[PDB]
Amino acid sequence: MTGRQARAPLQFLPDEARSLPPPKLTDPRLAYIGFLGYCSGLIDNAIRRRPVLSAGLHRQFLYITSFVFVGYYLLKRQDYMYAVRDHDMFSYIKSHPEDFPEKDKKTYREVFEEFHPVR
Amino acid sequence: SWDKDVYPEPPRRTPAPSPQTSLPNPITYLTKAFDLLVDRPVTLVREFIERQHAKNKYYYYHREFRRVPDITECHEKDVLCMFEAEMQWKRDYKVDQEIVNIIQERLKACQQREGESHRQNCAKELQQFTQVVKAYQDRYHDLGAHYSARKCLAKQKQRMLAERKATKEAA
């Protein structure tokens, strides 16, 4: 799926994404990203033979900061993409009444089915 | 306690034994000794415990429900209608199983009370047992394990449509 108003620069997030609410701090996805950064720092201390859980706390803090920052911007991009998908979908629902009719909600007083008993 | 009209009991019939000859009667001495050694102390213990119970007063109530309308009034999908519908149907199913349990306990008690003549004063309870269980065999039986409520209404429609064809042939 492509443009969708192909003026469209490279544009990592438009100004229209500042209308939807931004992702909160300590949302569980960025907490999972922080845990993944801490596991990255632990295993980085494990690749070289420096001791684990020590001697790299500035690298631990750098990894956590870098992953949480990048994941924050990617989550804002995710929210923008889902918002524009729903906006385009409901615009197409409103723009064409013919193909999407009201279905007759026949209640179960008059809807017949087969039965097929398991004896 | 319990209602005497849902778990019925016939009135008691007890003779007065007239001893012909005089040995006499070991079990009378033994049941008087049983009364004096068992019946008095357990009664005193129960009376003490009942006073300790009736110092305070607890109460438990019976949980009661309402009538959410139907499954016959729910639409195509409408999951927040079918939910109340099928839970109301499932609670009817549980209480109806226990109706069958009550009738079958009545049949067992009629067997054991009436003695070695089964067919005297057990015709009525066997009659109502076959009645309610014919209703159960007609209504809930041949649907299987994944009953929700909708297979029961499908069986309902299919059975009354087959009997409609039968009475059309009988017309």
Other beta carbons within 10 angstroms of residue B13's beta carbon come to 5
Nearest to B72 among A105, A107, A114 (CB): A107
Residue in A70, A71, A44, A72 with CA at minimum distance from that of residue A57: A44
CB A59 within 8 A of CB A41: yes
**What single-letter amino acid sits at A112?**
F
Q: What is the distance in angstroms between the Cα of B94 and the nearest Cα belonging to chain A?
A: 21
Inter-chain CB proximity A103 and B153 less than 8 Å? no
Q: What is the largest CA-CA distance in chain A?
A: 75
Residue in B157, B122, B136, B147 with CA at minimum distance from that of residue B8: B122
Chain A residues with CB under 8 Å of a chain B CB are 103, 105-109, 111-115, 117-119
Tell me, yes or no, if B149 comes closer than 8 A to chain A by beta carbon: no
CB B110 within 8 A of CB B121: yes
Determination technique for this entry:
cryo-EM
Considering only CB atoms, which chain A residues are within 8 Å of B154? 113-115
Q: How far apart are CA B31 and CA B38, in angstroms?
A: 10
At residue B38, φ and ψ (nearest 5 deg) are: -120, -40
CA angle B17, B23, B29 (to 5 degrees): 70
Q: What is the distance in angstroms between the Cα of B166 and the nearest Cα belonging to chain A?
A: 19
Between the CA atoms of B152, B156, B161 and B162, what dihedral angle is there, to the nearest 10 degrees? 80
In chain A, the DSSP E strands lie at none
Nearest to A109 among B72, B76, B154 (CB): B72
Q: What is the distance in angstroms between the Cα of B73 and the nearest Cα belonging to chain A?
A: 6
Q: How far apart are CA B145 and CA B133, in angstroms?
A: 19
CB B149 within 8 A of CB B89: yes
Residue in A92, A80, A110 with CA at minimum distance from that of residue B75: A110
Joined together, the tokens standing for residue A6 give: 């192909």
CB B167 within 8 A of CB B141: no
Inter-chain CB proximity B73 and A107 less than 8 Å? yes
The residue of chain B nearest to residue A109, with distances taken between CA atoms, is B72
Q: What is the distance in angstroms between the Cα of A99 and the nearest Cα belonging to chain B?
A: 20
Distance between first and last Cα of chain B: 53
Three-state secondary-structure class, residue A105: coil
Residue in B87, B94, B123, B83 with CA at minimum distance from that of residue B107: B123
CB B111 within 8 A of CB B122: yes
Radius of gyration of chain A (CA): 25
CB A61 within 8 A of CB A42: no
Inter-chain CB proximity A105 and B143 less than 8 Å? no
Residues sharing a CB contact under 8 Å with residue A107, sequence separation 6 or more, in sequence order:
B72, B73, B74, B75, B76
Contacts 24+ apart (CB under 8 A), A66-69: A66/A37, A67/A33, A67/A34, A67/A36, A67/A37, A67/A40, A68/A30, A68/A33, A68/A34, A68/A37
Listing DSSP states for chain B in one string gives ---TTTS--PPP-------SS-S--HHHHHHHHHIIIIIHHHHHHHHHHHHHHTTS----PPP-------STT--SS-HHHHHHHHHHHHHHHHHHHHHHHHHHHHHHHHHHHHTT--SSS-HHHHHHHHHHHHHHHHHTSTT-S---SHHHHHHHHHHHHHHHHHHHHH-
- The tokens 């999951």 sit on which residue? B79
**Using the 8-state DSSP alphabet, how is residue A16 labeled?**
G
* DSSP3 helix / strand / coil % (chain A, rounded to 5): 55, 0, 45
Cα–chain-centroid distance for residue B68? 25
The ranges assigned to domains in chain A are 1-96
Considering only CB atoms, which chain A residues are within 8 Å of B157? 112
Joined together, the tokens standing for residue A92 give: 């197409």
Cα–chain-centroid distance for residue A8? 21
